[PDB]
Amino acid sequence: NGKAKVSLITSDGIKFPQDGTLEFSDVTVDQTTGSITLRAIFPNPDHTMMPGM
C-alpha cells in the first residue's frame, strides 16, 4: 500500500543497516541487457554506500 520497499544485501551476506524506497520503475527496457532498470533510493547517513558496488 506504500510504494515500495527494497533492502540491500552486499557482499557480506547480512542486510544493510536500513532500507528504503523503490522510487520508480523504468519502462524503457535497455536494448543490450533486455532488462528494466528500477531505481531504489536509500538513505545513507553513514557513507557506507558507495556509488557503484
Partner: protein, 53 residues
C-alpha cells in the same frame, strides 16, 4: 530538477531549471531595448498625434 522521476508528465510542463542567470540577462537586455524602442516610438507616436491636429 522539478519533476518526479518515473511519473507521467504532460506537454510543456516546465520541470527543469537550467540556470536562468545568463538568459535572464539577455532577456533583460532585450526587454530593456524594447523600452528603448517603445519610448522612442512613444514620442514618435506623439509627434504624429501632435502633428495630426
Amino acid at each position: 530538477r522539478n519533476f518526479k522521476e518515473g511519473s507521467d508528465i504532460e506537454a510543456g510542463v516546465s520541470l527543469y531549471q537550467i540556470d536562468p542567470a545568463t538568459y535572464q540577462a539577455t532577456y533583460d537586455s532585450a526587454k530593456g531595448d524594447l523600452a528603448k524602442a517603445q519610448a522612442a516610438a512613444n514620442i514618435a507616436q506623439l509627434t504624429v498625434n501632435r502633428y495630426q491636429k
